[PDB]
Design a protein around this ligand. Sequence first.
Ligand SMILES: CC1(N)CCN(c2cnc(Sc3cccc(Cl)c3Cl)c(N)n2)CC1
Length: 476
Amino acid sequence: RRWFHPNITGVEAENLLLTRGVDGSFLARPSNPGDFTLSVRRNGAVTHIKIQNTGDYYDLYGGEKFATLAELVQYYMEHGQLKIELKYPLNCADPTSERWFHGHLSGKEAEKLLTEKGKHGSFLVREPGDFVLSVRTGDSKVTHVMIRCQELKYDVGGGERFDSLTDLVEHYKKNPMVETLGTVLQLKQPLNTTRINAAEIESRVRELSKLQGFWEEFETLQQQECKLLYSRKEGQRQENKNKNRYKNILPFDHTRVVLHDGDPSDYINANIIMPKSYIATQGCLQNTVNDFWRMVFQENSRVIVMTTKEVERGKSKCVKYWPDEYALKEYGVMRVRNVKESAAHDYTLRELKLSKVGQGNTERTVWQYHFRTWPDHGVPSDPGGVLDFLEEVHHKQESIMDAGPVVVHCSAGIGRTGTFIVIDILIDIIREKGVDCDIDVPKTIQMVRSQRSGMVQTEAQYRFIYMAVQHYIETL
Ligand SMILES: CC1(N)CCN(c2cnc(Sc3cccc(Cl)c3Cl)c(N)n2)CC1
């Protein structure tokens, strides 16, 4: 993912592509903050293509919709689809989005962090133009290795000279430095500085709010998305193409929900998310409504969380897959009765009875929580509404013996869906373990992203997750 440059301007991108790149060279960068730009060299000139993300997916102008920028780049690198060829990534030497880079951090602060939070092989790199690599080794001690910047290259006092700190760190990760008395300076894992005690969320949010800290942390998490390019072959099959809301937003094969008692049709664009478990899925299409009810029935799910209106901005985000109040409908082999609807400030609850046609004894109540007030773009200005809704959903799920995973869906099933699920996972740790628990927001999001592509889409949702956890702790 070195083709992503976090701090460059359009003019800097043009100069880099014209002087250091060739026809086919490309890079991606942040823009209108919140948007991204794909800058590509074609026939000696540079084109800048807009990538928009309001919270549901990355929408590339003149291209398709994607779950992640890594999935977008992999797609165009492996497929005449962009109207523009993406042949050569133009690599970024900026270390600001590396997990181990801590810019302005003093040697005392670094020794304190490695001593309190580190273990064998924990390391960090901190900054007049030179850098310091600090490593903890043991069962213990901290060793500081000077990294010189001499004529644009980096070195540890001898040997190879690297074009970037990333190349240096990767080199000495593969080929560890050995102290002449035997100690191997193993760079096993970056020092974890994101894991906080829940009671100090206010302090961490205040520090992330200064010039912003939230942006740096989010883009450092985004930089790790290239480790999550898991196969999605089942969703790519000809017979499954029209079962996807967006052709390139697909479920990972290894966590997808497989539908078993089919017409003698094992596919649905949905994934199991394990942290209480969840099913993260897209809004129904007219041709997937029956598959949706087959999934809910098979998985024994008793609670559904819908995080979109049926229509937003004049566009269908989810077809109505449930009957009108008091009505009974058959959706293939499944029968649904809408027993009763209850309106609340931010949501509507629909009490549904689901059963298999011809088998009365299979009836179970499915409670559908339909959140109605999420803004068309961005996130809510206050998390209270989302928190009170998730608290109600949680108590409903907890009251039902052996209930299956909670189904959560929005439009593509990754942005608002990932946001609700991640807040739910974090607040569950705090409800049970109390305020004396460790929480790690990027760790939790990375874990959820390994089970469905692009879970949590934007820096605005990333910040909303911290705000929701802070609010939950303040009302404890
Ligand atoms: C100060 C910094 N420049 C920015 C903040 N920081 C940093 C480091 N790593 C991450 S990702 C991450 C975190 C925990 C577990 C997993 Cl699994 C992952 Cl993937 C992140 N979002 N931020 C340390 C370096």
